[PDB]
Amino acid sequence: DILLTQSPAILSVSPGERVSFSCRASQNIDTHIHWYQQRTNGSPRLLIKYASESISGIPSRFSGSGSGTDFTLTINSVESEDIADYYCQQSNSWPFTFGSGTKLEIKRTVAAPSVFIFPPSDEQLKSGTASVVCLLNNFYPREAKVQWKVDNALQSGNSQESVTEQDSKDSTYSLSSTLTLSKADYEKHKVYACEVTHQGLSSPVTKSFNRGEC
């Protein structure tokens, strides 16, 4: 198959910036490249056909230019509705393949995460499973590391994370890490701490609580 690699996996824009991302082919492809935009919870939308030809119904800011193996889509002045995923598609040979995608976000001033910790409720304890929830609130950028330490022991393969979409109002993100242990394993230890390292932090912040000690 033909491989299309889109170089900036994530790109941060500001309303009005002149932006461009790339799509590189594994072999020669001539001009058989189309571009699609996909907003969150939406369907792909045709933007540019055959590398550079425009589509009726698309604002004039969108335009493509590449040929051969390198391809580029440019938005000459980013608007808010341009915050979406962008996929390139080749039509030169079967099977048709898409690029890995390029995600646009909104750039804002760096913000540190407000960290919180939540012990498992006594009601959940009575069922046989404990869930400890570490919450990171309204930070930027999205990159963050959450380490789970139980009695100074790093845990692996027992926590799942989840990140909201970028807030439309303040352009921040939120994260939630849920450490899951059995009721037996939960009561065997005492110190439960989640370690949060983020760009808006001079050093990692730790949020901890001792079991049964309210």
Partner: protein, 221 residues
């Protein structure tokens, strides 16, 4: 006007098969290629194959031959896709889109809304809601944090409101994750003034329509 309407969501068990539909109106059906694209949640697009509207000739991706089967009925202006021997890995959103007229080399012109297919052995079950009580030490920014843990439910989705819709500001309902047990889990948190923990009363309204379950959970220090 060109409309491409797809079938509704499908919840299937492993081993069975499902037929996805793609009705295309607003233009002359015969002559256009109809394309099928697969998108796993949080991943990119993936081309399954194509079918000619009038003549029914099919071209399949090497990855999907034997799993996807394209059919079309000129009389109802509808294209179909049959997904056989269903795997949990087949769980994705499936798009159909009108391709080029006569030439499938053209761009994907008019996309459908997509069809979400979930394949799982789990049985549908209402969620257990547990409180995320605000900490005793709540002066972390003169702001407290509370919420509900919506644990062990299948299938998607759940709707979480706060104070019957009266509390919306500062509410973060995280996207659901699939636990190892095959059941989905979710958390909905909110930040409130630390001076209002004694006066104000916070209830999360958790609804799970596929199980006909509704749960109100009060959280308090």
């Amino acid at each position: 006007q060109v409309q491409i309407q797809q079938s509704g969501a499908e919840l299937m068990r492993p081993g069975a098969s499902v037929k996805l539909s793609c009705k295309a109106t607003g233009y002359t059906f015969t002559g256009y290629w109809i394309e099928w694209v697969k998108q796993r949640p949080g991943h990119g697009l993936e081309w399954i194959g194509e079918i000619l509207s009038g003549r029914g000739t099919t071209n399949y991706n090497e990855k999907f031959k034997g799993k996807a089967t394209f059919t079309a009925d000129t009389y109802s202006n509808t294209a179909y896709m049959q997904l056989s021997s269903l795997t949990t890995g087949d769980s994705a959103i499936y798009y159909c889109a009108r391709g080029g007229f006569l030439y499938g080399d053209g761009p994907f012109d008019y996309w459908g809304q997509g069809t979400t297919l979930t394949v799982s052995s789990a049985s549908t079950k209402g969620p257990s809601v547990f409180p995320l009580a605000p900490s005793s030490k709540s002066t972390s920014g003169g702001t407290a944090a509370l919420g509900c843990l919506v644990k062990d439910y299948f299938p998607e989705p759940v709707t979480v409101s706060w104070n019957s819709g009266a509390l919306t500001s500062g509410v973060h309902t995280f996207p659901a994750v699939l636990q190892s047990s095959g059941l989905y889990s979710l958390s909905s948190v909110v930040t409130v003034p630390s001076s209002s923990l004694g006066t104000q009363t916070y209830i999360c309204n958790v609804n799970h329509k596929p199980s006909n379950t509704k749960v109100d959970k009060r959280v308090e220090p």
